[PDB]
Coordinates of C-alpha atoms and ligand atoms in Angstrom, one line a residue:
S1 CA -12.9 18.3 -34.3
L2 CA -10.9 20.8 -32.0
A3 CA -13.0 23.5 -30.2
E4 CA -12.4 27.2 -31.3
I5 CA -13.5 30.0 -28.9
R6 CA -16.4 32.2 -30.2
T7 CA -16.2 36.0 -29.9
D8 CA -19.5 36.8 -31.8
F9 CA -23.0 35.9 -30.4
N10 CA -24.8 35.9 -33.8
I11 CA -25.1 32.1 -34.0
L12 CA -26.2 31.9 -30.3
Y13 CA -28.9 34.6 -30.8
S14 CA -30.2 32.5 -33.9
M15 CA -30.5 29.4 -31.6
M16 CA -32.3 31.3 -28.8
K17 CA -34.8 33.0 -31.2
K18 CA -36.1 29.5 -32.1
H19 CA -38.2 29.3 -28.9
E20 CA -40.3 32.1 -27.2
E21 CA -39.4 30.3 -23.9
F22 CA -35.7 31.6 -24.4
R23 CA -36.7 35.3 -24.6
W24 CA -35.7 36.4 -21.0
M25 CA -32.4 34.4 -21.3
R26 CA -31.6 36.0 -24.7
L27 CA -32.1 39.6 -23.2
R28 CA -29.8 38.7 -20.3
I29 CA -27.1 37.4 -22.6
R30 CA -27.5 40.6 -24.8
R31 CA -27.1 42.9 -21.7
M32 CA -23.9 41.0 -20.6
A33 CA -22.5 40.2 -24.1
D34 CA -19.5 42.7 -24.0
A35 CA -18.5 41.3 -20.6
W36 CA -18.6 37.7 -21.9
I37 CA -16.5 38.4 -25.0
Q38 CA -13.9 40.4 -22.9
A39 CA -13.7 37.4 -20.5
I40 CA -13.2 34.6 -23.1
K41 CA -10.5 36.7 -24.7
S42 CA -8.8 37.3 -21.2
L43 CA -9.0 33.6 -20.3
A44 CA -7.5 32.6 -23.7
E45 CA -4.5 35.0 -23.0
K46 CA -3.9 33.4 -19.5
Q47 CA -4.4 29.7 -20.3
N48 CA -3.9 27.5 -23.4
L49 CA -7.5 26.8 -24.6
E50 CA -6.0 25.0 -27.7
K51 CA -6.1 21.2 -28.3
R52 CA -9.6 20.9 -26.6
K53 CA -11.9 18.4 -28.4
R54 CA -15.2 20.0 -29.6
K55 CA -18.0 18.2 -27.7
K56 CA -21.5 17.6 -29.0
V57 CA -23.5 18.8 -25.9
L58 CA -27.2 18.3 -25.2
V59 CA -28.7 21.2 -23.1
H60 CA -32.2 20.0 -22.1
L61 CA -34.1 22.7 -20.1
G62 CA -36.8 20.5 -18.4
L63 CA -38.1 23.6 -16.5
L64 CA -39.0 25.3 -20.0
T65 CA -40.8 22.2 -21.5
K66 CA -44.6 22.5 -22.0
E67 CA -44.6 18.8 -20.9
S68 CA -43.1 19.8 -17.4
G69 CA -46.0 22.3 -16.7
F70 CA -43.5 24.4 -14.7
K71 CA -44.6 27.7 -16.4
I72 CA -41.3 29.6 -15.5
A73 CA -41.1 31.2 -19.0
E74 CA -44.7 32.5 -18.4
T75 CA -43.7 34.5 -15.3
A76 CA -40.1 35.6 -16.3
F77 CA -41.2 39.3 -16.8
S78 CA -43.9 39.6 -14.1
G79 CA -42.0 38.8 -10.8
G80 CA -41.7 34.9 -11.2
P81 CA -38.5 32.8 -10.3
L82 CA -35.4 33.7 -12.4
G83 CA -32.4 32.1 -10.6
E84 CA -32.5 28.9 -12.7
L85 CA -32.9 31.0 -15.9
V86 CA -29.8 33.1 -14.8
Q87 CA -27.8 29.8 -14.4
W88 CA -29.0 28.2 -17.7
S89 CA -28.3 31.6 -19.6
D90 CA -24.7 31.6 -18.2
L91 CA -24.1 27.9 -18.8
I92 CA -25.3 28.1 -22.4
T93 CA -23.2 31.2 -23.0
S94 CA -20.0 29.6 -21.4
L95 CA -20.4 26.4 -23.6
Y96 CA -21.0 28.6 -26.7
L97 CA -17.9 30.8 -26.1
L98 CA -15.7 27.8 -25.3
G99 CA -16.5 26.6 -28.9
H100 CA -18.6 23.5 -28.1
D101 CA -21.4 22.2 -30.5
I102 CA -24.5 22.9 -28.3
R103 CA -27.9 21.3 -29.2
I104 CA -30.5 23.2 -27.1
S105 CA -33.7 21.4 -26.3
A106 CA -36.9 22.6 -24.5
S107 CA -39.2 19.8 -25.8
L108 CA -39.4 16.0 -25.8
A109 CA -39.3 16.1 -29.6
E110 CA -35.9 18.0 -29.6
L111 CA -34.6 15.7 -26.8
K112 CA -35.5 12.6 -28.9
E113 CA -34.0 14.0 -32.2
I114 CA -30.7 15.2 -30.6
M115 CA -30.2 11.8 -28.8
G116 CA -31.3 10.1 -32.0
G117 CA -28.5 11.9 -33.9
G118 CA -25.9 10.2 -31.7
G119 CA -22.4 11.3 -30.9
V120 CA -23.6 13.3 -27.8
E121 CA -20.6 13.5 -25.3
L122 CA -22.1 15.7 -22.5
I123 CA -25.6 16.3 -21.3
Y124 CA -26.7 19.3 -19.1
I125 CA -30.2 18.8 -17.7
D126 CA -32.3 19.5 -14.6
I127 CA -34.0 16.9 -12.4
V128 CA -37.5 17.5 -14.1
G129 CA -35.6 17.0 -17.4
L130 CA -33.9 13.8 -16.2
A131 CA -37.3 12.2 -15.5
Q132 CA -38.2 13.1 -19.2
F133 CA -34.8 11.8 -20.5
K134 CA -35.4 8.4 -18.7
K135 CA -39.1 8.1 -20.0
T136 CA -38.2 9.2 -23.6
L137 CA -35.1 7.0 -24.2
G138 CA -36.3 3.9 -22.2
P139 CA -33.7 1.5 -20.6
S140 CA -30.7 2.7 -22.7
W141 CA -31.0 6.1 -20.8
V142 CA -28.4 4.4 -18.4
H143 CA -26.0 4.2 -21.4
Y144 CA -25.6 8.0 -21.1
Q145 CA -25.8 8.3 -17.3
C146 CA -22.0 9.1 -16.9
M147 CA -22.4 12.1 -19.3
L148 CA -25.1 13.8 -17.2
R149 CA -24.5 17.1 -15.3
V150 CA -27.6 17.8 -13.4
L151 CA -28.5 21.4 -12.5
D152 CA -29.9 21.1 -9.0
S153 CA -29.8 24.5 -7.2
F154 CA -30.0 23.4 -3.5
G155 CA -27.8 20.2 -3.8
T156 CA -28.4 16.5 -3.4
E157 CA -26.8 14.7 -0.5
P158 CA -25.7 11.0 -0.9
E159 CA -28.3 9.6 1.5
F160 CA -31.1 11.0 -0.8
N161 CA -29.4 10.0 -4.1
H162 CA -29.0 6.2 -3.2
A163 CA -32.5 4.9 -4.0
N164 CA -32.4 1.9 -1.6
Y165 CA -30.8 3.7 1.3
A166 CA -33.2 6.7 0.9
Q167 CA -36.2 4.2 1.0
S168 CA -34.6 2.5 4.1
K169 CA -34.5 6.0 5.8
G170 CA -38.1 6.9 4.7
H171 CA -37.0 9.8 2.5
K172 CA -40.0 10.6 0.3
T173 CA -38.2 13.3 -1.8
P174 CA -39.6 13.4 -5.3
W175 CA -36.2 14.8 -6.4
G176 CA -33.8 12.0 -5.3
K177 CA -33.1 8.3 -5.9
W178 CA -31.3 8.8 -9.2
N179 CA -28.2 6.7 -8.1
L180 CA -25.8 9.1 -9.9
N181 CA -22.3 9.9 -8.8
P182 CA -23.3 12.9 -6.6
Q183 CA -20.4 15.1 -8.1
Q184 CA -22.7 15.0 -11.2
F185 CA -25.2 17.4 -9.4
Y186 CA -24.3 21.0 -10.2
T187 CA -25.3 23.6 -7.5
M188 CA -26.1 27.3 -7.5
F189 CA -23.6 28.0 -4.6
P190 CA -20.7 25.9 -3.1
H191 CA -22.8 24.7 -0.2
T192 CA -22.7 20.9 -0.9
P193 CA -19.1 19.4 -1.3
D194 CA -20.7 16.0 -2.3
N195 CA -21.8 18.0 -5.4
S196 CA -20.0 20.2 -8.0
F197 CA -20.4 24.0 -7.7
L198 CA -21.7 25.4 -11.1
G199 CA -22.9 28.9 -10.1
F200 CA -23.6 31.7 -12.6
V201 CA -22.2 35.2 -13.4
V202 CA -23.3 38.2 -11.2
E203 CA -24.7 40.9 -13.6
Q204 CA -23.3 44.5 -12.9
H205 CA -22.8 47.5 -15.2
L206 CA -20.3 49.8 -13.3
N207 CA -17.0 51.1 -14.8
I208 CA -19.6 56.4 -7.0
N209 CA -20.2 58.2 -3.6
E210 CA -22.1 60.9 -5.7
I211 CA -24.2 58.2 -7.6
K212 CA -25.1 56.3 -4.4
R213 CA -27.8 57.9 -2.1
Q214 CA -26.3 57.3 1.4
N215 CA -29.9 57.3 2.7
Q216 CA -31.5 54.7 0.3
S217 CA -32.3 51.1 1.3
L218 CA -34.0 48.6 -1.0
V219 CA -36.0 45.6 0.2
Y220 CA -35.2 42.2 -1.3
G221 CA -38.7 40.7 -1.8
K222 CA -40.7 41.0 -5.0
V223 CA -43.8 39.3 -3.5
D224 CA -46.1 40.8 -0.8
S225 CA -46.2 37.5 1.3
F226 CA -42.4 37.8 1.9
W227 CA -43.0 41.0 4.0
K228 CA -45.3 39.3 6.6
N229 CA -44.3 40.2 10.3
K230 CA -41.3 42.4 9.2
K231 CA -42.7 45.8 10.5
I232 CA -40.4 46.3 13.7
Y233 CA -37.4 45.4 11.4
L234 CA -38.4 47.8 8.6
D235 CA -39.3 50.5 11.2
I236 CA -35.7 50.4 12.6
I237 CA -34.2 50.7 9.1
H238 CA -36.8 53.5 8.2
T239 CA -35.5 55.4 11.3
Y240 CA -32.2 56.0 9.4
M241 CA -33.0 55.4 5.6
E242 CA -35.7 55.6 2.9
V243 CA -37.1 52.1 2.3
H244 CA -37.6 51.3 -1.4
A245 CA -39.2 48.1 -2.9
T246 CA -39.8 46.3 -6.2
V247 CA -43.1 44.5 -5.4
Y248 CA -45.7 43.3 -8.0
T249 CA -49.7 45.3 -1.0
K250 CA -51.2 44.8 2.5
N251 CA -47.9 43.6 4.1
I252 CA -46.0 46.7 2.9
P253 CA -45.7 49.7 5.3
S254 CA -47.2 53.1 3.9
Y255 CA -43.6 54.8 4.0
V256 CA -42.2 52.2 1.5
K257 CA -41.3 53.6 -2.0
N258 CA -42.5 50.8 -4.4
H259 CA -40.9 50.9 -8.0
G260 CA -42.8 47.7 -9.0
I261 CA -41.1 44.8 -10.9
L262 CA -38.3 46.4 -12.9
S263 CA -36.6 45.4 -16.2
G264 CA -32.9 44.2 -15.8
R265 CA -31.3 47.6 -16.7
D266 CA -33.7 49.6 -14.4
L267 CA -33.1 47.2 -11.5
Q268 CA -29.3 47.6 -12.0
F269 CA -29.7 51.4 -12.0
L270 CA -31.7 51.2 -8.7
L271 CA -28.9 48.9 -7.1
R272 CA -26.1 51.3 -8.2
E273 CA -27.9 54.2 -6.3
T274 CA -28.8 52.0 -3.2
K275 CA -26.6 51.9 0.0
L276 CA -28.3 48.9 1.7
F277 CA -30.1 45.8 0.3
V278 CA -32.5 44.5 2.9
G279 CA -33.1 40.7 3.3
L280 CA -36.5 39.7 4.9
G281 CA -35.5 36.0 5.4
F282 CA -36.9 34.6 2.1
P283 CA -36.0 33.8 -0.7
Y284 CA -33.0 31.5 0.2
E285 CA -29.8 31.5 -1.8
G286 CA -30.7 33.7 -4.8
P287 CA -28.5 35.7 -7.1
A288 CA -30.0 39.2 -6.1
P289 CA -27.9 39.8 -3.0
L290 CA -24.7 39.2 -5.0
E291 CA -25.9 41.6 -7.7
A292 CA -26.5 44.2 -4.9
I293 CA -22.9 43.6 -3.5
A294 CA -21.4 43.8 -7.0
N295 CA -23.0 47.3 -7.2
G296 CA -21.5 48.5 -3.9
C297 CA -24.7 47.8 -1.8
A298 CA -24.3 46.3 1.7
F299 CA -26.6 43.2 2.3
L300 CA -28.5 42.9 5.6
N301 CA -28.7 39.1 5.8
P302 CA -31.2 37.6 8.4
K303 CA -29.4 35.1 10.7
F304 CA -31.2 31.7 11.3
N305 CA -30.9 30.2 14.8
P306 CA -31.7 27.5 14.7
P307 CA -30.4 27.0 11.1
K308 CA -33.2 26.3 8.5
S309 CA -33.6 22.8 6.9
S310 CA -36.3 20.2 5.9
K311 CA -36.5 19.6 9.8
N312 CA -38.1 23.0 10.6
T313 CA -39.0 24.8 7.3
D314 CA -41.8 23.9 4.8
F315 CA -39.9 25.1 1.8
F316 CA -37.1 22.4 2.3
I317 CA -39.5 19.4 3.0
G318 CA -39.0 16.9 0.2
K319 CA -35.7 18.6 -1.0
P320 CA -33.0 15.9 -1.4
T321 CA -30.7 17.2 1.4
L322 CA -30.6 17.8 5.2
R323 CA -28.3 20.8 4.7
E324 CA -29.0 23.6 7.2
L325 CA -28.9 27.3 6.2
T326 CA -27.3 29.6 8.9
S327 CA -28.8 32.7 7.2
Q328 CA -30.9 33.8 4.2
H329 CA -27.7 33.7 2.0
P330 CA -25.0 31.4 3.7
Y331 CA -22.5 32.0 0.8
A332 CA -22.8 35.8 1.3
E333 CA -22.4 35.2 5.1
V334 CA -19.4 32.9 5.1
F335 CA -17.5 33.6 1.8
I336 CA -18.1 37.5 1.8
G337 CA -19.0 38.7 5.3
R338 CA -18.5 42.3 6.6
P339 CA -18.4 45.0 5.5
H340 CA -20.5 43.9 2.4
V341 CA -22.7 41.5 4.4
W342 CA -24.1 42.0 7.9
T343 CA -25.6 38.8 9.2
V344 CA -28.0 39.9 12.0
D345 CA -30.7 38.5 14.4
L346 CA -33.9 40.3 13.1
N347 CA -35.2 40.1 16.8
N348 CA -32.2 41.9 18.2
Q349 CA -33.4 45.6 17.6
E350 CA -30.1 46.9 19.0
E351 CA -28.0 44.6 16.6
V352 CA -30.2 45.7 13.6
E353 CA -29.9 49.4 14.5
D354 CA -26.1 49.1 15.1
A355 CA -25.8 47.3 11.6
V356 CA -27.8 50.1 9.8
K357 CA -25.7 52.9 11.5
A358 CA -22.5 51.0 10.6
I359 CA -23.5 50.5 7.0
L360 CA -24.5 54.2 6.8
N361 CA -20.9 55.1 7.9
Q362 CA -19.2 52.5 5.6
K363 CA -17.0 53.4 2.6
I364 CA -18.6 51.9 -0.7
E365 CA -16.5 49.0 -2.1
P366 CA -18.2 47.2 -5.0
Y367 CA -17.1 43.5 -4.8
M368 CA -17.6 40.3 -6.8
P369 CA -15.9 36.9 -5.9
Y370 CA -13.8 35.7 -8.9
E371 CA -15.9 32.5 -9.2
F372 CA -19.0 34.7 -9.9
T373 CA -17.3 36.7 -12.7
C374 CA -17.5 35.9 -16.5
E375 CA -13.8 34.8 -16.5
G376 CA -14.2 32.8 -13.2
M377 CA -17.2 30.9 -14.5
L378 CA -15.5 30.1 -17.9
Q379 CA -12.4 28.9 -16.1
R380 CA -14.5 26.6 -13.8
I381 CA -16.8 25.1 -16.5
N382 CA -13.8 24.7 -18.9
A383 CA -12.0 22.7 -16.1
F384 CA -15.1 20.6 -15.5
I385 CA -15.6 19.8 -19.2
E386 CA -11.9 19.0 -19.8
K387 CA -11.1 17.2 -16.5
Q388 CA -14.3 15.8 -14.9
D389 CA -14.9 12.3 -16.2
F390 CA -17.4 9.8 -14.6
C391 CA -17.1 7.5 -17.8
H392 CA -13.7 5.9 -16.7
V393 CA -7.4 10.7 -15.6
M394 CA -8.0 10.7 -11.8
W395 CA -9.3 14.3 -11.1
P396 CA -8.8 16.0 -8.8
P397 CA -5.2 14.5 -8.5
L398 CA -4.4 12.4 -5.4
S399 CA -1.6 15.0 -4.7
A400 CA -4.4 17.3 -3.4
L401 CA -5.6 14.9 -0.6
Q402 CA -5.2 16.1 3.0
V403 CA -6.8 13.7 5.5
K404 CA -8.6 15.1 8.6
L405 CA -10.4 13.3 11.5
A406 CA -13.8 14.8 12.3
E407 CA -14.7 14.8 16.0
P408 CA -18.0 13.2 17.1
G409 CA -20.9 15.5 16.1
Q410 CA -18.7 17.0 13.3
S411 CA -19.2 16.2 9.5
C412 CA -16.4 15.8 6.9
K413 CA -17.8 19.0 5.3
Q414 CA -17.3 20.9 8.7
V415 CA -13.8 19.5 9.5
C416 CA -12.4 20.4 6.0
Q417 CA -14.0 23.9 6.2
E418 CA -12.5 24.5 9.8
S419 CA -8.9 24.0 8.2
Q420 CA -9.8 26.4 5.3
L421 CA -10.1 23.3 3.0
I422 CA -13.1 21.6 1.3
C423 CA -14.2 18.0 1.4
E424 CA -13.3 16.1 -1.8
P425 CA -15.6 13.0 -2.1
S426 CA -13.6 11.6 -5.1
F427 CA -10.8 10.7 -2.5
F428 CA -13.0 8.5 0.0
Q429 CA -12.0 5.4 -2.1
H430 CA -8.4 6.0 -0.9
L431 CA -9.4 6.0 2.8
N432 CA -11.4 2.7 3.0
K433 CA -9.2 -0.2 4.3
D434 CA -6.6 -1.0 7.1
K435 CA -3.5 -0.6 4.9
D436 CA -4.7 2.9 3.6
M437 CA -5.4 4.0 7.3
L438 CA -1.7 3.3 8.4
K439 CA -0.5 5.9 5.9
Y440 CA -2.6 8.6 7.8
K441 CA -1.4 7.3 11.2
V442 CA -4.8 5.7 12.2
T443 CA -4.2 2.0 13.4
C444 CA -7.2 -0.3 13.2
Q445 CA -6.8 -3.0 16.0
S446 CA -10.2 -4.3 14.6
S447 CA -12.5 -3.4 11.6
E448 CA -15.9 -4.2 10.0
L449 CA -17.9 -3.1 6.9
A450 CA -21.1 -1.0 7.1
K451 CA -23.4 0.5 4.4
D452 CA -23.7 3.9 6.2
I453 CA -23.1 7.6 5.0
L454 CA -21.1 8.1 8.3
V455 CA -18.1 5.7 7.4
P456 CA -15.2 5.4 7.2
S457 CA -15.2 5.8 11.0
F458 CA -12.6 5.4 13.8
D459 CA -13.2 4.6 17.5
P460 CA -9.9 5.9 18.9
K461 CA -10.7 4.4 22.4
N462 CA -11.2 0.8 21.0
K463 CA -9.0 1.4 17.9
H464 CA -12.0 0.0 15.9
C465 CA -12.4 1.1 12.1
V466 CA -15.8 0.7 10.3
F467 CA -15.2 0.9 6.4
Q468 CA -17.7 1.7 3.7
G469 CA -19.5 -1.4 2.1
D470 CA -21.5 0.6 -0.5
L471 CA -19.3 3.0 -2.4
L472 CA -22.4 5.0 -3.5
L473 CA -22.9 6.0 0.3
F474 CA -19.6 8.0 0.6
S475 CA -20.7 11.3 2.0
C476 CA -19.1 14.6 3.0
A477 CA -22.4 15.4 4.8
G478 CA -23.2 13.8 8.2
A479 CA -21.6 13.7 11.6
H480 CA -20.9 10.4 13.6
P481 CA -22.6 10.8 17.1
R482 CA -19.9 8.6 18.8
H483 CA -16.9 8.0 16.5
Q484 CA -14.4 10.1 14.5
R485 CA -14.9 10.3 10.7
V486 CA -11.9 9.8 8.4
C487 CA -12.4 12.8 6.0
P488 CA -10.9 13.5 2.6
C489 CA -10.1 17.3 2.2
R490 CA -8.5 19.2 -0.6
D491 CA -7.1 22.7 -1.0
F492 CA -9.1 25.3 -3.0
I493 CA -8.0 28.5 -4.9
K494 CA -9.2 31.6 -2.9
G495 CA -12.1 32.9 -5.1
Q496 CA -12.4 29.6 -7.0
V497 CA -13.4 26.9 -4.4
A498 CA -14.5 24.4 -7.2
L499 CA -10.8 23.9 -8.2
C500 CA -7.7 22.7 -6.3
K501 CA -4.3 24.4 -7.0
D502 CA -3.2 21.5 -9.3
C503 CA -6.6 21.1 -11.0
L504 CA -6.3 23.5 -14.0
Ligands
LIG1 C1 -36.6 24.7 -11.7 C2 -36.2 23.8 -10.6 O1 -36.6 22.6 -10.6 N1 -35.6 24.4 -9.5 C3 -35.1 23.7 -8.4 C4 -36.3 23.2 -7.5 O2 -37.0 24.4 -7.0 C5 -38.4 24.3 -6.8 C6 -39.0 24.5 -8.2 O3 -40.4 24.4 -8.2 C7 -40.8 24.6 -9.6 C8 -42.3 24.7 -9.7 O4 -42.8 23.4 -9.8 C9 -44.2 23.3 -9.9 O5 -44.6 23.8 -11.2 C10 -45.0 24.2 -8.8 O6 -44.9 23.4 -7.6 C11 -44.4 25.6 -8.6 O7 -44.8 26.2 -7.4 C12 -45.6 27.4 -7.6 O8 -46.9 27.2 -7.3 C13 -47.2 27.0 -5.9 C14 -48.7 26.8 -5.7 O9 -49.0 25.5 -6.2 C15 -46.7 28.3 -5.0 O10 -46.6 27.9 -3.7 C16 -45.3 28.8 -5.4 O11 -45.3 30.2 -5.0 C17 -45.0 28.7 -6.9 O12 -45.3 29.9 -7.5 C18 -42.8 25.5 -8.6 O13 -42.3 26.8 -8.6 O14 -38.6 25.8 -8.7 C19 -39.0 26.9 -7.8 C20 -38.5 28.2 -8.5 O15 -37.2 28.6 -8.0 C21 -38.5 26.7 -6.3 O16 -39.0 27.7 -5.4 C22 -38.8 25.3 -5.8 O17 -38.2 25.1 -4.6 O18 -35.9 22.4 -6.4 C23 -35.2 21.2 -6.8 C24 -34.9 20.4 -5.6 O19 -34.3 21.1 -4.6 C25 -33.9 21.7 -7.5 O20 -33.2 20.5 -8.0 C26 -34.2 22.5 -8.7 O21 -32.9 23.1 -9.2
U2F2 O1 -43.0 34.9 -7.9 C1 -42.1 34.3 -7.2 C2 -40.8 34.6 -7.4 C3 -39.8 34.0 -6.6 N1 -40.2 33.1 -5.7 C4 -39.3 32.4 -4.8 O2 -38.0 33.1 -4.7 C5 -37.0 32.1 -5.0 C6 -35.7 32.8 -5.6 O3 -36.1 33.8 -6.5 P1 -35.2 34.1 -7.8 O4 -34.7 32.7 -8.3 O5 -36.0 34.8 -8.9 O6 -33.9 34.8 -7.4 P2 -33.7 36.4 -6.8 O7 -32.7 36.4 -5.8 O8 -35.0 37.0 -6.5 O9 -33.1 37.1 -8.1 C7 -33.8 37.2 -9.3 O10 -34.6 38.4 -9.5 C8 -33.9 39.6 -9.6 C9 -34.8 40.8 -9.8 O11 -35.5 41.0 -8.6 C10 -32.8 39.6 -10.7 O12 -32.0 40.8 -10.6 C11 -32.0 38.3 -10.4 O13 -31.0 38.1 -11.4 C12 -32.8 37.1 -10.4 F1 -32.2 35.9 -10.2 C13 -37.6 31.1 -6.0 O14 -37.0 29.9 -6.0 C14 -39.0 31.0 -5.4 O15 -39.1 30.1 -4.4 C15 -41.6 32.9 -5.5 O16 -42.0 32.1 -4.5 N2 -42.5 33.5 -6.2

């Protein structure tokens, strides 16, 4: 009944051999196996991992179900999407190493059988999977709702999650209206403080100036369509560097050295010899740029002005968020930055040329943020499993609360970030009446209730407070056009933004 850490993958390899759909994920785990085992040993030396209860865990991979018709397993080796498979691989491995009893499902049959068996304590699932869960179990699916952790790469903002509020705003997202606690949404990057950051591990095989060809650039973009209207950009880079590619070819200049779609180990070799990894603008927020940076590549990161969102970009229409991307990879831009990441206006030929010349003259510094290491991911998911409880113990602890007042036109996300903090939506409940507001030296001469994502709000001219009337509408996202927002912030560990200092 207590969890014991695992240091041998033999049982995991047995579980993943049982579906062809797991093949790509099994090969990833195999490539990274020695790093994983080193990391769970290192974590166990730093932190008491004793006295943890072994959980029975459902892992339901909706994206790999026949019944989903997503056909992601089908394209895993031929240039199809991999970012979700990377995250599922790393989650399953983390759960396994931490000693939990994992029940892996990629079918309605397995889903039914596991949930039939009872004693499930935690459920990892995607939004496509959650639709299947609800249909399969019937009305008692809600009995398990507080155990769900929903892998949702791009994030779900509260205004899309609240079914009635979303309807009232005319949000037609096919992904939203689940009415969960939004911290139950697990994201690919820490872009949505209403949600939890799950992430993944960045694959790299280094243990360097002679290995790396100073002259060699590699284009990020494994599909021909991605290269449309990039020729001035690529011509500037080609003035100074060889331009290589991994494309599965009418958009691709004649001078480009195409290697085709590479296996994991061959791609990693290509990164380790590359000076510059070249963003074209798409895809958004993938793992590949972090893999490049972990291998000592600089990343040329197209700047978006205006920032891209469901308001101006087809890709984002129907996604359950209004979040705006300031670049192809905002995490790389904001949490890494120069010299590893150069965020440039692709239409500023002088800025592009200056960036390429700078990168040519840079010293090579392989870099991985701690939160994207094996040990960083184990520490984060262990903390979530042990401390995150939506089933009713307050975590993060109230000690971590720092209250900030967002100016008009400023969100709670923005005001926390501007103080090197992060919005903590679990603390909004402590900011939502006259008495609580005195504590933080805001004085409500009058007040009212509103069901609005933009409250609690303060008019400092009229000394008027609007408080939240629907607790499911508490939202880090959103700026009040007229009033100040009363914003719950917390500290974060540098390199581990998911955790406060007193959260371990
Ligand atoms: C796996 C998952 O749900 N990932 C996140 C999701 O991302 C979207 C998702 O779409 C999955 C596939 O769903 C259907 O099977 C199709 O619509 C696929 O499109 C394919 O065919 C199109 C032609 O009809 C073509 O335009 C396109 O090139 C593609 O080959 C979808 O791929 O997964 C993909 C893969 O990363 C992603 O690009 C999609 O945005 O978004 C959810 C909401 O934000 C998120 O919760 C989830 O994690
Ligand atoms: O055929 C396709 C494929 C993708 N896309 C789009 O690209 C998006 C992100 O691609 P992907 O998830 O595979 O991540 P990427 O950064 O390329 O890294 C993978 O691929 C890398 C190898 O290139 C690998 O090293 C890394 O670990 C992986 F995560 C995906 O959500 C699709 O919208 C597409 O439209 N058509």
